[PDB]
Each structure stands twice: as C-alpha cells, then as structure tokens.
Swiss-Prot record:
Compartment(s): Secreted, Cell wall; Membrane
Domain notes: The number of the intragenic tandem repeats varies between different S.cerevisiae strains. There is a linear correlation between protein size and the extend of adhesion: the more repeats, the stronger the adhesion properties and the greater the fraction of flocculating cells.
Renumbered residue ranges of the record's region Sugar recognition: 184-227
Function: Cell wall protein that participates directly in adhesive cell-cell interactions during yeast flocculation, a reversible, asexual and Ca(2+)-dependent process in which cells adhere to form aggregates (flocs) consisting of thousands of cells. The lectin-like protein sticks out of the cell wall of flocculent cells and selectively binds mannose residues in the cell walls of adjacent cells. Activity is inhibited by mannose, but not by glucose, maltose, sucrose or galactose.
Residues modified by glycosylation: N122, N174, N190, N249
Gene field: FLO5
Use case: For many industrial applications in which the yeast S.cerevisiae is used, e.g. beer, wine and alcohol production, appropriate flocculation behavior is one of the most important characteristics of a good production strain. The ability of yeast cells to flocculate is of considerable importance, as it provides an effective, environment-friendly, simple and cost-free way to separate yeast cells from the fermentation product at the end of fermentation.
Modification note: Extensively O-glycosylated.
Protein's recorded name: Flocculation protein FLO5
Annotated ranges, domain PA14: 61-236
Residues that span the membrane, as ranges: none
Part of the full-length chain shown: 23 to 271 of 1075
Amino acid sequence: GLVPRGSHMSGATEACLPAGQRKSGMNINFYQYSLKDSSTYSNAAYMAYGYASKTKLGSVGGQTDISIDYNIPCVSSSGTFPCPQEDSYGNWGCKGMGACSNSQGIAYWSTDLFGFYTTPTNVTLEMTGYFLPPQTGSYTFSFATVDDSAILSVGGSIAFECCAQEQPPITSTNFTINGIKPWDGSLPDNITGTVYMYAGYYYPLKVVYSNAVSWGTLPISVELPDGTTVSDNFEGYVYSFDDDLSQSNCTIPDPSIH
Ligand SMILES: OC[C@H]1O[C@H](O[C@@H]2[C@@H](O[C@H]3[C@@H](O)[C@H](O)[C@@H](CO)O[C@H]3O)O[C@H](CO)[C@@H](O)[C@@H]2O)[C@@H](O)[C@@H](O)[C@@H]1O
Ligand SMILES: [Ca+2]
Ligand SMILES: [Ca+2]
Ligand SMILES: [Cl-]
Ligand code: NA
Ligand code: NA
C-alpha cells in the first residue's frame, strides 16, 4: 500500500516534536522522603505522582549520567570513606577499612546524587527529559537492580505530556518498568521493559527513584535495536526542553503515520 497501515489498535507509543531550544540531559527534582519509611514507596500512586505532594528540596538540570550508586560512609581508623555494600560485613566493618564506628541507620548528607546536597539515604527523585532514538526499532530499558523503589515510564501521556516537561506529574501508572518495592519485600517481578520507537521523534521519559535507608542503587541501561547496550551515561540520547504549552503540533499520537 502507498502508506504504512499503522500499529494495531493505536498501539504506537506517543512521541513529540518540540520546536524550542534543545538542552542536553535530564532534569532531576528532589523530594522529601522519610528515613526508614518502608511503606510509602510501595504505592503506585506515590511513585507515579504522589511524591510531588511532599516538600520539593531542589533540582539540578542537564544530567546525562543517570544511574544511582550511593554508598554510605564508613567512619574507620584511617578516616571516613564510602563503603561499597558488597564490602560491608559484620556489625559492621568495610573490607579494607576495619570496623566502622557509625550507624547504618541514620541519615547522611552528601552531593553524590547529581551534585545536589541532600540526604541520599532518604529521598525521592524524579528524572525527566526526552529520549531521542537514533534508530527505528525495539528498545529494552532495564534496571540491573533496585534499592529501594523505582519506576521508569516512556511515552507521551505516560511519562508526561508533550512540550510540558516542567509541569506537575501526570497520574499514569502504566509504567514501562515497575520496580516498586513489594509490600512483602523481595524483588519486583520484572525490572526490563520494551518500547518500539521511531528515529528522530522525542519520547517523554520519566524515572522516579526512592531510597529509605543506607545504600541506594539504580543501574539504568537501554539495549538499542542494533543489539548494543548503553549503560549509565545517556549523553546523546536524552534532552530537555523548556515548557511550551502553546505549541499546537507538538504531540505525535502515532509516529508511524506522521
Ligand atoms: O531493604 C532494606 C534495606 O536493607 C539494607 O539496610 C540495612 C538493613 O539492616 C537489616 C539488619 O542488618 C539490621 O540489623 C536491622 C536493624 O535496623 O535492619 C535490618 O533490615 O536495614 C537497616 C534499617 O532498618 C539499615 O540501616 C541497614 O543498612 C540495605 O540494603 C538498604 O539499602 C535497604 O534499603
Ligand atoms: Ca495526554
Ligand atoms: Ca536503601
Ligand atoms: Cl577489613
Ligand atoms: Na554501591
Ligand atoms: Na563517605
């Protein structure tokens, strides 16, 4: 036929063509989360949008390295140094440092998350921006692990609305990756998710991440159509645009027929 038929039952993921000045990287907003609260982050409504009803702590823009790898301090005989969780032992020490005098159960202040001074032990953050596929095909996003709770959403009307990156969060719970901490503890059922994307369109991307205590971990990757994997550093793939709610043609409901 002269034209492609389109994805079945309007199945294509909504994308965007923002006309304004493109900025490299994602915006990261930080919100209050209570130390050792092991329940709030288990609710889908909280992880999709309820986080923004808590106090906003601040923000950083232009972030291309988006994985989280926060290690608490070990106050050791030779000074205070971050302890990789796999090197923690006993009650407690850190391999190569001896016994640690400090508690694993208190808040710690650091700039480890995106250079922003906060409590990485206990915080929720929202990463927003647009993913620009260089290749048409299936993209598989993944979290290698999650400590404590996280979601990833892709698409207009799923992550956020086209040309409206800076607005309060939308209520969609149709997550691309549901990494929400189960009520029974243990691992979420599935921490990949796949999206079919068309080259050159901008796909809204949202990651919401929470830590309640001590270590924080969220190693983010994407497998491209060509089979290669991009991990941690998404430079060249993620961008931000200032809101333009007046750009009438911004939303592309079905990129295969655009
Ligand atoms: O999944 C929850 C967190 O687990 C780890 O945090 C540690 C965890 O400690 C456990 C025992 O070792 C402690 O003696 C006991 C005392 O509170 O708690 C158990 O759950 O939980 C503590 C908080 O209660 C933390 O202080 C410990 O660091 C770690 O993987 C965290 O990143 C997880 O969020
Ligand atoms: Ca919409
Ligand atoms: Ca934790
Ligand atoms: Cl040691
Ligand atoms: Na770590
Ligand atoms: Na430290």
